[PDB]
Scaffold this active site. Structure first.
Site, PDB file in Angstrom:
ATOM      1  N   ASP C  34      12.966  -7.116  25.199  1.00 27.52           N
ATOM      2  CA  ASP C  34      11.592  -7.157  24.751  1.00 27.52           C
ATOM      3  C   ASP C  34      11.049  -8.560  24.970  1.00 27.52           C
ATOM      4  N   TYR C  35       9.959  -8.628  25.721  1.00 30.02           N
ATOM      5  CA  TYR C  35       9.186  -9.848  25.866  1.00 30.02           C
ATOM      6  C   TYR C  35       7.715  -9.478  25.702  1.00 30.02           C
ATOM      7  N   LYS C  37       4.039 -10.299  26.763  1.00 24.83           N
ATOM      8  CA  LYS C  37       3.019 -10.943  27.601  1.00 24.83           C
ATOM      9  C   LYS C  37       1.772 -11.251  26.763  1.00 24.83           C
ATOM     10  N   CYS C  56      -0.423  -0.269  13.599  1.00 21.59           N
ATOM     11  CA  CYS C  56      -0.401   0.462  12.315  1.00 21.59           C
ATOM     12  C   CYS C  56      -0.226  -0.419  11.109  1.00 21.59           C
ATOM     13  N   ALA C 124      11.247  -8.130  32.030  1.00 17.70           N
ATOM     14  CA  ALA C 124      12.152  -7.346  32.872  1.00 17.70           C
ATOM     15  C   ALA C 124      11.452  -6.507  33.936  1.00 17.70           C
ATOM     16  N   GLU C 327      -0.082   8.796  21.281  1.00 20.68           N
ATOM     17  CA  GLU C 327       0.212   7.402  21.105  1.00 20.68           C
ATOM     18  C   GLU C 327       0.396   7.092  19.625  1.00 20.68           C
ATOM     19  N   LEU C 328       1.425   7.686  19.036  1.00 21.42           N
ATOM     20  CA  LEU C 328       1.794   7.422  17.644  1.00 21.42           C
ATOM     21  C   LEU C 328       3.235   6.938  17.578  1.00 21.42           C
ATOM     22  N   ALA C 329       3.529   5.964  16.710  1.00 20.98           N
ATOM     23  CA  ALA C 329       4.899   5.433  16.607  1.00 20.98           C
ATOM     24  C   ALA C 329       5.948   6.497  16.292  1.00 20.98           C
ATOM     25  N   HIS C 456      -3.985  19.786 -10.078  1.00 23.05           N
ATOM     26  CA  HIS C 456      -5.291  19.426 -10.598  1.00 23.05           C
ATOM     27  C   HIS C 456      -5.201  18.207 -11.496  1.00 23.05           C
TER      28      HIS C 456
HETATM   29  C1  LIG Z   1      -4.650  -1.217  16.478  1.00 26.70           C
HETATM   30  C2  LIG Z   1      -3.632  -0.122  16.533  1.00 26.70           C
HETATM   31  C3  LIG Z   1      -3.354   0.623  15.398  1.00 26.70           C
HETATM   32  C4  LIG Z   1      -2.402   1.645  15.448  1.00 26.70           C
HETATM   33  N1  LIG Z   1      -2.141   2.340  14.329  1.00 26.70           N
HETATM   34  C5  LIG Z   1      -1.227   3.328  14.347  1.00 26.70           C
HETATM   35  C6  LIG Z   1      -0.950   4.066  13.192  1.00 26.70           C
HETATM   36  O1  LIG Z   1      -1.617   3.760  12.019  1.00 26.70           O
HETATM   37  N2  LIG Z   1      -0.039   5.046  13.200  1.00 26.70           N
HETATM   38  C7  LIG Z   1       0.610   5.321  14.327  1.00 26.70           C
HETATM   39  O2  LIG Z   1       1.551   6.346  14.331  1.00 26.70           O
HETATM   40  N3  LIG Z   1       0.377   4.645  15.458  1.00 26.70           N
HETATM   41  C8  LIG Z   1      -0.533   3.635  15.509  1.00 26.70           C
HETATM   42  N4  LIG Z   1      -0.785   2.938  16.652  1.00 26.70           N
HETATM   43  C9  LIG Z   1      -0.023   3.302  17.861  1.00 26.70           C
HETATM   44  C10 LIG Z   1       1.387   2.736  18.009  1.00 26.70           C
HETATM   45  O3  LIG Z   1       1.408   1.333  17.853  1.00 26.70           O
HETATM   46  C11 LIG Z   1       2.025   3.155  19.327  1.00 26.70           C
HETATM   47  O4  LIG Z   1       1.923   4.519  19.426  1.00 26.70           O
HETATM   48  C12 LIG Z   1       3.467   2.741  19.435  1.00 26.70           C
HETATM   49  O5  LIG Z   1       3.542   1.362  19.347  1.00 26.70           O
HETATM   50  C13 LIG Z   1       4.141   3.115  20.716  1.00 26.70           C
HETATM   51  O6  LIG Z   1       5.442   2.639  20.821  1.00 26.70           O
HETATM   52  P1  LIG Z   1       6.117   2.374  22.210  1.00 26.70           P
HETATM   53  O7  LIG Z   1       7.600   2.181  22.036  1.00 26.70           O
HETATM   54  O8  LIG Z   1       5.943   3.630  23.052  1.00 26.70           O
HETATM   55  O9  LIG Z   1       5.363   1.135  22.887  1.00 26.70           O
HETATM   56  P2  LIG Z   1       5.064  -0.285  22.257  1.00 26.70           P
HETATM   57  O10 LIG Z   1       5.064  -0.203  20.758  1.00 26.70           O
HETATM   58  O11 LIG Z   1       3.745  -0.812  22.755  1.00 26.70           O
HETATM   59  O12 LIG Z   1       6.194  -1.299  22.687  1.00 26.70           O
HETATM   60  C14 LIG Z   1       6.267  -1.914  23.923  1.00 26.70           C
HETATM   61  C15 LIG Z   1       6.872  -3.263  23.917  1.00 26.70           C
HETATM   62  O13 LIG Z   1       7.421  -3.552  25.154  1.00 26.70           O
HETATM   63  C16 LIG Z   1       6.974  -4.814  25.585  1.00 26.70           C
HETATM   64  N5  LIG Z   1       6.982  -4.838  27.077  1.00 26.70           N
HETATM   65  C17 LIG Z   1       6.140  -4.327  27.990  1.00 26.70           C
HETATM   66  N6  LIG Z   1       6.633  -4.576  29.214  1.00 26.70           N
HETATM   67  C18 LIG Z   1       7.809  -5.238  29.079  1.00 26.70           C
HETATM   68  C19 LIG Z   1       8.774  -5.763  29.966  1.00 26.70           C
HETATM   69  N7  LIG Z   1       8.589  -5.615  31.354  1.00 26.70           N
HETATM   70  N8  LIG Z   1       9.885  -6.392  29.524  1.00 26.70           N
HETATM   71  C20 LIG Z   1      10.065  -6.531  28.203  1.00 26.70           C
HETATM   72  N9  LIG Z   1       9.176  -6.050  27.312  1.00 26.70           N
HETATM   73  C21 LIG Z   1       8.046  -5.399  27.715  1.00 26.70           C
HETATM   74  C22 LIG Z   1       5.710  -5.059  24.792  1.00 26.70           C
HETATM   75  O14 LIG Z   1       5.628  -6.413  24.409  1.00 26.70           O
HETATM   76  C23 LIG Z   1       5.814  -4.242  23.678  1.00 26.70           C
HETATM   77  O15 LIG Z   1       6.150  -4.924  22.449  1.00 26.70           O
HETATM   78  C24 LIG Z   1      -1.722   1.941  16.629  1.00 26.70           C
HETATM   79  C25 LIG Z   1      -2.013   1.185  17.759  1.00 26.70           C
HETATM   80  C26 LIG Z   1      -2.957   0.171  17.716  1.00 26.70           C
HETATM   81  C27 LIG Z   1      -3.201  -0.565  18.985  1.00 26.70           C
HETATM   82  C1  LIG Z   2      -4.455  15.046 -22.387  1.00 26.84           C
HETATM   83  C2  LIG Z   2      -4.224  16.241 -21.510  1.00 26.84           C
HETATM   84  C3  LIG Z   2      -4.171  16.077 -20.151  1.00 26.84           C
HETATM   85  C4  LIG Z   2      -3.953  17.160 -19.298  1.00 26.84           C
HETATM   86  N1  LIG Z   2      -3.919  16.905 -17.973  1.00 26.84           N
HETATM   87  C5  LIG Z   2      -3.726  17.917 -17.107  1.00 26.84           C
HETATM   88  C6  LIG Z   2      -3.694  17.666 -15.731  1.00 26.84           C
HETATM   89  O1  LIG Z   2      -3.872  16.366 -15.290  1.00 26.84           O
HETATM   90  N2  LIG Z   2      -3.508  18.664 -14.852  1.00 26.84           N
HETATM   91  C7  LIG Z   2      -3.342  19.909 -15.296  1.00 26.84           C
HETATM   92  O2  LIG Z   2      -3.133  20.944 -14.377  1.00 26.84           O
HETATM   93  N3  LIG Z   2      -3.358  20.183 -16.609  1.00 26.84           N
HETATM   94  C8  LIG Z   2      -3.554  19.227 -17.562  1.00 26.84           C
HETATM   95  N4  LIG Z   2      -3.577  19.508 -18.908  1.00 26.84           N
HETATM   96  C9  LIG Z   2      -3.391  20.925 -19.311  1.00 26.84           C
HETATM   97  C10 LIG Z   2      -4.571  21.889 -19.151  1.00 26.84           C
HETATM   98  O3  LIG Z   2      -5.746  21.280 -19.624  1.00 26.84           O
HETATM   99  C11 LIG Z   2      -4.447  23.261 -19.825  1.00 26.84           C
HETATM  100  O4  LIG Z   2      -3.352  23.951 -19.362  1.00 26.84           O
HETATM  101  C12 LIG Z   2      -5.675  24.097 -19.552  1.00 26.84           C
HETATM  102  O5  LIG Z   2      -6.696  23.718 -20.400  1.00 26.84           O
HETATM  103  C13 LIG Z   2      -5.447  25.567 -19.736  1.00 26.84           C
HETATM  104  O6  LIG Z   2      -5.612  26.087 -21.004  1.00 26.84           O
HETATM  105  P1  LIG Z   2      -6.395  27.432 -21.268  1.00 26.84           P
HETATM  106  O7  LIG Z   2      -7.311  27.842 -20.149  1.00 26.84           O
HETATM  107  O8  LIG Z   2      -5.318  28.493 -21.447  1.00 26.84           O
HETATM  108  O9  LIG Z   2      -7.216  27.263 -22.617  1.00 26.84           O
HETATM  109  P2  LIG Z   2      -7.886  25.912 -23.100  1.00 26.84           P
HETATM  110  O10 LIG Z   2      -8.234  25.068 -21.894  1.00 26.84           O
HETATM  111  O11 LIG Z   2      -7.004  25.113 -24.024  1.00 26.84           O
HETATM  112  O12 LIG Z   2      -9.233  26.236 -23.838  1.00 26.84           O
HETATM  113  C14 LIG Z   2      -9.374  27.252 -24.764  1.00 26.84           C
HETATM  114  C15 LIG Z   2     -10.755  27.395 -25.278  1.00 26.84           C
HETATM  115  O13 LIG Z   2     -10.737  28.341 -26.288  1.00 26.84           O
HETATM  116  C16 LIG Z   2     -11.524  27.851 -27.326  1.00 26.84           C
HETATM  117  N5  LIG Z   2     -11.237  28.624 -28.558  1.00 26.84           N
HETATM  118  C17 LIG Z   2     -10.114  28.670 -29.299  1.00 26.84           C
HETATM  119  N6  LIG Z   2     -10.314  29.543 -30.292  1.00 26.84           N
HETATM  120  C18 LIG Z   2     -11.563  30.082 -30.183  1.00 26.84           C
HETATM  121  C19 LIG Z   2     -12.302  31.037 -30.930  1.00 26.84           C
HETATM  122  N7  LIG Z   2     -11.719  31.656 -32.084  1.00 26.84           N
HETATM  123  N8  LIG Z   2     -13.563  31.361 -30.555  1.00 26.84           N
HETATM  124  C20 LIG Z   2     -14.107  30.784 -29.463  1.00 26.84           C
HETATM  125  N9  LIG Z   2     -13.442  29.870 -28.720  1.00 26.84           N
HETATM  126  C21 LIG Z   2     -12.169  29.498 -29.059  1.00 26.84           C
HETATM  127  C22 LIG Z   2     -11.226  26.372 -27.241  1.00 26.84           C
HETATM  128  O14 LIG Z   2     -12.202  25.590 -27.892  1.00 26.84           O
HETATM  129  C23 LIG Z   2     -11.221  26.135 -25.884  1.00 26.84           C
HETATM  130  O15 LIG Z   2     -12.530  25.754 -25.366  1.00 26.84           O
HETATM  131  C24 LIG Z   2      -3.786  18.460 -19.790  1.00 26.84           C
HETATM  132  C25 LIG Z   2      -3.839  18.608 -21.180  1.00 26.84           C
HETATM  133  C26 LIG Z   2      -4.054  17.520 -22.034  1.00 26.84           C
HETATM  134  C27 LIG Z   2      -4.091  17.768 -23.505  1.00 26.84           C
END
Ligand SMILES: Cc1cc2nc3c(=O)[nH]c(=O)nc-3n(C[C@H](O)[C@H](O)[C@H](O)COP(=O)(O)OP(=O)(O)OC[C@H]3O[C@@H](n4cnc5c(N)ncnc54)[C@H](O)[C@@H]3O)c2cc1C
Ligand SMILES: Cc1cc2nc3c(=O)[nH]c(=O)nc-3n(C[C@H](O)[C@H](O)[C@H](O)COP(=O)(O)OP(=O)(O)OC[C@H]3O[C@@H](n4cnc5c(N)ncnc54)[C@H](O)[C@@H]3O)c2cc1C
EC number: 1.8.1.9
Lengths: 483, 103, 483, 103
Positions: C34-35, C37, C56, C124, C327-329, C456
């Protein structure tokens, strides 16, 4: 036989609304009740349920506020951004959060009337196996009745503050209170080891509050413990203190602060105590004993079969209020929708509760779907389970010099390393996990991951070249760096 | 201190010297510039050892020869032969090593 | 027959290194050159290739810098964060970027020697069909030779500045220059419609620079144009100007600025002109005409078959330098590794180039895998393709009141709506797309998306309840909000 | 202007009045507070119409009855019956509507 409505559902949460909208699109006359009983602290909200008002939505929004804070504080300087006087305003955040919740209240309402579902803001309960008696606006002054061909209970859950701890109920807040809290939380004790506990701790700390978590369990019971530990550890690095194996035994108000006395006889002053030790089925006011509907304690949840049937043939339960169903909104929604079709569209779908994906919005995020390592060993035997994994550094994080990330797959050797467990710790966990969850449902094998081309650079591509196994005993630590 | 800048110069100082300790560091490495001032202090303190820094990017051939894989790396050479190797920026760890041969 | 080495590869980029390391693990004596340029502006870098040094990696890092800027400026106030005197330091960012690149140089080097691949920093070229003559350090003073049983060309590409535009080559920079630029870019003209052009424009603008993009025709050729437009549009809203259908015809240095005269006879003063109109195969100094190896212009790329063979049986080409390969790594890496196995481990794998996922890091991101809408219509007929889609608001964004996002699936009606196209516009595209790309390779159908439970709240869950189709003619606009 | 706050009060003003125009708005809605001052101007200018605002969150039953689905929504009531409906915060669009019945 004649009924006022074909379908009357109690609960305007995700499950109830979904079930109602779906039943109306297949011809049914649907009526839906939603009323919100006030929280321990007298907090209430609009239509939509737990998710929109006091769950996923405001949770995700505050997480973003806190994640933002971490970026300013940890990464911004390294990336060339300079600023002064960085501070956070709790009131401002709450208005932004609540204001967007209010907009969702509206769209959910207009969504109901479009679907042709009659909505009543009323507290509802069972009279008999085809009759519901409601109290309009929750007033006990005027009781009404309505009959239905089928009744759905979807009343969800509420946070549980324990009875046997002095001052808890009177002094602490819950998740029902935090997203609308009028005061700054200040120094905060969070009791509990659930994702709600971990998530709230997380954002309050990222926001800039002295935060303690009191646990007498293990963090994230039933999640993969390797990930659970990695997450806890990260939170400790960020400043959240954990009192392990100690819980409050008494809480006393004094001078607008709360003195907490723990089981270990030590004591401490806090500004706010948030209990997040688990939720219980909101069934108490539904008068279920009168129909002898079997329920479970201490879930306080309704027992329903795979078809969402209670032991009363005209009554059904979906969502949080139903025993052993994952407490996620998308789960309540799909079960609701499937029930609505079996009932009013002669469908024979059955809700599938396997490979449900989930994601935790802790200061380092964790997404998962399927079995943990341990539970796979338990149910299939250790020698029949291969675990592929790799700790690695997030590219954007690792250039700051503030392992961050873990990619872990759990496979069945005897089914050609078909993937039965996916776990990922690192940024954007929910976004990474969704597609993977789908792959697990397609019965993906480890070699399929190997033949998929990765997207570079992303945390998710780590799953596409994962080769260290737990039983190889080789290192899977993050290389570098420098090094 | 004194920084080595060629392969000839490097083996020269391991040859015509009895006790020599070397700091393998990188300019882009955080922990190798961090333990770097503390290294200057033992230069004067333990004159029963000649202290040298090698840039890892610069003397590519030496870095291939001492098996340098992480910075900062510290290697103790006695009578022309490597005897000890310490990987890390712990001021405490380095003090335990230089005392093992000088003091 | 005896050779100096079993495998000699020219190119220390992703393809070359992967192919070399892999061949060494199956017994081979490998030597790799690897060199680097120098660029048009005389810029050079360490080992690793385009991705690590001028692709990347530094791209993603600067994207993060700019995305950070957008958060401070658009979202932070709504979320309660206050600060003063926000400014960005171009020099600081470049040191952070370059310093992390330098660390990757090192690990890539030690990675080569661990794999037992001999590395020579040498320019190379081909002597004959089994002989490579190299120039050590690129000096023409001392030429050496080495022979090899097999020769791999992986020399990649370089950015192309056009010959027929006055002062371009002498005055403009390219992607080889931008990530190490010593001066502030200042007011910037970017010429080109590739993701490189869009990505550079994106971050320079997020960073706080007056940015113009000279585009001919349309952005992101080859990608889904609906998404391409949505992305452009979003960039326009953020401040980047587009001169559509006009390109520079002359560039003149004057007073440390560049006066650009466009095809439309208008003219403008800039601080920096970045050409990003496409890259060309780096083969010119390889002496390929002498072996009569068939190449293509104007790619300036080597013609290789599906097994990476050139028309010379001992010579092969992988990666960027090879005609018609993405052209992805990760693509170069997998092809390299597969070639190494067919050669030195008797494998009969064939590189699969279908359903390659990719992701663009524009100020709104776009990830894709599979066919665009248009190309699906073209190859299967419009009436045989169904397109599901939905515009929606990201939850965290929509609460700011600054559609952001688009979820689009492309399906084959005659194969049970099996998904052949995935396209997503919104945050964290690369993280969302990875798992989806995998699903497409498992031959996923639209109903599989429908039966997967969603996570959720996430942008990715939008694909799990996607029901509006293009041919329904129904609206797929984002609802709300207010509304 | 004057803001309606109940269902009784609402139908009262559509009953015992001949020409009435109503602004359906939300406190959390951007464009409904934005077109809101311009609405106050036509209150005085076109006294051949009684101007009223209804909060959509507050009078839930009216909002269900007028089919309000987006804010701001403007509905013209003549002789107790809805005749026109305009959705949007365009000052220009609103001027064309109030002139259609008052001026
Ligand atoms: C800005 C940018 C962002 C990118 N972001 C992503 C990303 O988020 N995700 C992703 O999957 N891909 C990304 N890519 C693409 C990724 O970098 C390439 O797909 C990957 O590098 C290809 O690998 P390679 O081995 O085929 O070639 P290269 O990684 O280019 O390697 C070739 C190497 O050989 C050397 N070389 C060339 N000729 C000679 C020689 N005669 N002798 C010795 N050494 C030589 C070069 O210096 C070079 O380092 C991005 C590319 C760019 C430009
Ligand atoms: C702090 C906290 C965070 C949570 N975070 C998540 C999360 O990030 N992701 C996730 O998937 N789940 C989460 N949950 C769980 C989720 O909210 C519950 O599983 C969901 O509410 C389902 O309950 P339910 O539909 O069976 O009834 P409930 O949602 O509990 O509601 C029942 C309703 O019946 C009413 N009720 C009761 N008795 C009567 C009555 N006699 N007359 C009229 N109305 C009545 C109540 O007031 C209420 O409005 C969380 C729970 C808590 C406490």
């Amino acid at each position: 036989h004649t009924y006022d409505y074909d379908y009357v559902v109690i609960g305007g949460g995700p499950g109830g609304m979904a079930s109602a909208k779906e039943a109306a699109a297949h011809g049914a006359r649907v009526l839906l009740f939603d009323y919100v009983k006030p929280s321990s602290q007298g907090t209430k909200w609009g239509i939509g349920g737990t998710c929109v008002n006091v769950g996923c939505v405001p949770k995700k929004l505050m997480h973003y506020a806190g994640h933002m804070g971490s970026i300013f504080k940890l990464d911004s300087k390294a990336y060339g951004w300079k600023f002064d006087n960085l501070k956070h305003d709790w009131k401002k955040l709450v208005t932004t959060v609540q204001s967007h919740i209010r907009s969702l209240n509206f769209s959910y309402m207009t969504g109901l009337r479009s679907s042709k579902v009659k909505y009543i803001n009323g507290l509802a309960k069972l009279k008999d196996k085809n009759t519901v008696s409601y109290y309009l606006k929750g007033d006990l002054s005027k009781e009404e009745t309505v009959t239905g061909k089928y009744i759905l209970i979807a009343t969800g859950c509420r946070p549980h503050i324990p009875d046997d701890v002095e001052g808890a109920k009177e002094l602490s807040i819950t998740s029902d209170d935090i997203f609308s809290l009028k005061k700054d939380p200040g120094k905060t004790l969070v009791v509990g080891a659930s994702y709600v506990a971990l998530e709230c701790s997380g954002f309050l700390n990222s926001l800039g509050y002295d935060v303690t978590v009191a646990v007498r369990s293990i963090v994230l019971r039933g999640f993969d413990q390797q990930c659970a530990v990695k997450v806890k550890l990260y939170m400790e690095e960020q400043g959240v203190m954990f009192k392990n194996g100690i819980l409050p035994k008494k809480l006393t108000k004094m001078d607008d602060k709360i003195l907490v006395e723990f089981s270990d006889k030590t004591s401490e002053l806090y500004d706010t105590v948030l209990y997040a030790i688990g939720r219980k089925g909101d069934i108490d006011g539904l008068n279920l004993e009168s129909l002898n509907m079997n329920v479970n304690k201490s879930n306080n949840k309704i027992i329903a079969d795979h078809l969402s049937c209670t032991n009363i043939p005209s009554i059904f339960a979906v969502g949080d209020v139903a025993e052993n169903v994952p407490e996620l909104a998308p789960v309540a929604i799909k079960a609701g929708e499937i029930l609505a079709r079996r009932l009013f569209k002669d469908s024979d779908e059955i809700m599938d509760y396997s490979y449900i994906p989930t994601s935790i919005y802790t200061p380092i995020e964790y997404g998962a779907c399927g079995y943990s390592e341990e539970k796979a060993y338990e149910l299939y035997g250790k020698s029949n389970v291969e675990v592929f994994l790799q700790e690695f550094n997030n590219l954007e994080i690792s250039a700051v010099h503030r392992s961050t990330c873990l990619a872990k797959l759990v496979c069945l050797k005897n089914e050609d390393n078909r993937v039965i467990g996916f776990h990922y710790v690192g940024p954007n966990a929910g976004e990474v996990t969704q597609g993977m969850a789908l792959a697990l449902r397609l019965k993906v094998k480890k070699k399929d991951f190997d033949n998929c081309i990765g997207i570079h650079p992303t945390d998710a591509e780590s799953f596409m070249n994962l080769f260290v196994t737990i039983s190889s005993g080789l290192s899977y630590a993050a290389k570098g760096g420098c090094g | 201190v004194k920084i080595v800048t060629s392969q000839a110069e490097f083996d020269s100082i391991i040859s015509q010297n009895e006790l020599v300790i070397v700091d393998f560091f990188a300019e882009w490495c955080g922990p190798s510039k961090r333990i770097a001032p503390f290294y200057e202090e033992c230069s004067k303190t333990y004159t029963k050892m000649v202290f040298i820094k090698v840039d890892v990017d610069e003397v590519s051939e030496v870095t291939e020869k001492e098996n340098i894989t992480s910075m900062p790396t510290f290697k103790v050479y006695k009578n022309g032969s490597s005897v000890d190797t310490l990987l890390g920026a712990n001021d405490s760890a380095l003090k335990q090593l230089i005392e093992k041969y000088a003091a």
